[PDB]
From Swiss-Prot, chain B:
The chain holds residues 52 to 101 of 1407 of the full protein. Transmembrane segments: none annotated. Zn(2+) 1 binds at C19, C21, C34, C37. It comes from Escherichia coli O157:H7. Signal peptide: none annotated. The RNAP catalytic core consists of 2 alpha, 1 beta, 1 beta' and 1 omega subunit. When a sigma factor is associated with the core the holoenzyme is formed, which can initiate transcription. This is DNA-directed RNA polymerase subunit beta'.
Swiss-Prot record, chain C:
Homodimer. The RNAP catalytic core consists of 2 alpha, 1 beta, 1 beta' and 1 omega subunit. When a sigma factor is associated with the core the holoenzyme is formed, which can initiate transcription. Belongs to the RNA polymerase alpha chain family. DNA-dependent RNA polymerase catalyzes the transcription of DNA into RNA using the four ribonucleoside triphosphates as substrates. Residues 1-75 are annotated as: Alpha C-terminal domain (alpha-CTD). The N-terminal domain is essential for RNAP assembly and basal transcription, whereas the C-terminal domain is involved in interaction with transcriptional regulators and with upstream promoter elements. One of its GO terms (biological process) is DNA-templated transcription. Keywords: DNA-directed RNA polymerase, Nucleotidyltransferase, Transcription, Transferase. The chain holds residues 250 to 324 of 329 of the full protein. GO terms for molecular function: DNA binding; DNA-directed RNA polymerase activity; protein dimerization activity. GO terms for cellular component: cytoplasm; DNA-directed RNA polymerase complex. This is DNA-directed RNA polymerase subunit alpha.
From Swiss-Prot, chain D:
This is RNA polymerase sigma factor RpoD. Disulfide bonds: none annotated. It is found in: Cytoplasm. Coiled coil: none annotated. Belongs to the sigma-70 factor family. RpoD/SigA subfamily. Residues 12-65 are annotated as: Sigma-70 factor domain-4. It comes from Escherichia coli (strain K12). Residues 38-57 bind DNA. Interacts transiently with the RNA polymerase catalytic core formed by RpoA, RpoB, RpoC and RpoZ (2 alpha, 1 beta, 1 beta' and 1 omega subunit) to form the RNA polymerase holoenzyme that can initiate transcription. Identified in a complex containing RpoD, the RNA polymerase subunits RpoA, RpoB and RpoZ, CRP and DNA. Interacts with Rsd; this prevents interaction with the RNA polymerase catalytic core and with promoter DNA, and as a consequence, promotes transcription from promoters that require alternative sigma factors. The record marks R27 as: Interaction with anti-sigma factors. Residues 49-64 are annotated as: Interaction with anti-sigma factors. It comes from the Bacteria. The gene is rpoD.
Length: 50, 50, 75, 78
């Protein structure tokens, strides 16, 4: 994506869009919702994430 | 078509375990060659190998 | 409740007890719980054990027998 | 989806009487390359054919039963 400044940041940091990361880290979320069991399966999971 | 460029008799079938005429199916006839069309009962995969 | 309005086959009933239910014009679970125990025991084929395990499964899914309704049936 | 589905199905199959589960497996080609029939269930279990139909029905009661249905319910929207 486009970049801008993080002036407050510390060296180890990157400002990050939510939605971009949401998409990038999907199957982790799914593994963790089958873990917690909020989505018993992945159709439910996908519907929740949607 | 037979003995052409896509000769499924030689290069493999088009689908998972289905002859061209539809005779033999679903791994019942695993290592079977549809004698009508001379087509092996195997994946579409080997269209990339053979 | 959402569980008043179910047919009893969601409980996975048994054939003898099923014949006892259909024999006695008991349609809804709201119609079940309005019926009383002695109104069942006198009936055909409902002696000792039907009452036992139906008491078990209603103890399972959070309801009981002989309760009282009002504004029934909304249909 | 297919994998978690199928494992859940087998975990439902484990809870039944023997003849129930094995019949309902081979009768549908489950777990095999086979495709076995009401008639052939007659041939193997015992020649009784349509009591197997009634047994199928009774198992569908035993298992549909919305205490087990809800692992399957997400697959209703399939
Ligand atoms: Zn063919």
């Amino acid at each position: 994506s486009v970049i801008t400044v993080g002036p407050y940041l510390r060296l180890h940091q990157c400002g990050l869009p939510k939605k971009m990361a949401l998409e990038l880290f999907k199957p982790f979320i799914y593994g963790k919702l089958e873990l917690r069991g909020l989505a018993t399966t992945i159709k439910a999971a996908k519907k929740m994430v949607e | 078509e037979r003995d052409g460029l896509f000769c499924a008799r030689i290069f493999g079938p088009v689908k998972d375990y289905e002859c061209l005429c539809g005779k033999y199916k679903r791994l019942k006839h695993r290592g079977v060659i549809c004698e009508k069309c001379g087509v092996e009962v195997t994946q579409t995969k080997v269209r990339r190998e053979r | 409740d959402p569980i008043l309005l179910r047919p009893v086959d969601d409980l996975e009933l048994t054939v003898r007890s099923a014949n006892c239910l259909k024999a006695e014009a008991i349609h809804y679970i709201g119609d079940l719980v309005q019926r009383t125990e002695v109104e069942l025991l006198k009936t055909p084929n409902l002696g000792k054990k039907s009452l036992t395990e139906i008491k078990d499964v209603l103890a399972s899914r959070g309801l009981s027998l002989g309760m009282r309704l009002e504004n029934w049936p909304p249909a | 989806t297919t994998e978690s589905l199928r494992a859940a199905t087998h975990d439902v199959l484990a809870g039944l009487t023997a003849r129930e589960a094995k019949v309902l497996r081979m009768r549908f080609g489950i777990d095999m390359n086979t495709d076995y029939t009401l008639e052939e269930v007659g041939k193997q279990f015992d020649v009784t054919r349509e009591r197997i139909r009634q047994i199928e029905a009774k198992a569908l009661r035993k298992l549909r039963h919305p205490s087990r249905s809800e692992v399957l319910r997400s697959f209703l929207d399939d």
